[PDB]
């Protein structure tokens, strides 16, 4: 029965971990888009005139 209990615990913790990882992926993609915009602004407005 220890194996049953451990199975339940592992399952639950595994879904929690996967949800956290997916949220991290989404946030990372958004930050990447924002930083790409920032790089474009830096390279275009500073080194020249807009």
């Amino acid at each position: 029965e220890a194996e049953v209990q451990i199975d339940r615990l592992i399952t639950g913790r595994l879904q929690s971990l996967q949800t956290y990882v997916t949220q991290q992926l989404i946030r990372a993609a958004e930050i990447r888009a924002s930083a790409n915009l920032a790089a474009t602004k830096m390279s275009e407005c500073v080194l020249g005139q807009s």
């Binding site: 390279s43 275009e44 080194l47 020249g48």
Partner: protein
Amino acid sequence: KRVDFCGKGYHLMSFPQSAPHGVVFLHVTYVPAQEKNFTTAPAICHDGK
């Protein structure tokens, strides 16, 4: 006209080429060299004008 969008330096023209899963741009760019020093001035007076 936007700087550093295509190439490093003043841009002239470009050519596209294909790839298995993408595109490849060849950019032709203009870059100066062989500078000097000289001496400058903002305006020149003459007859008070």
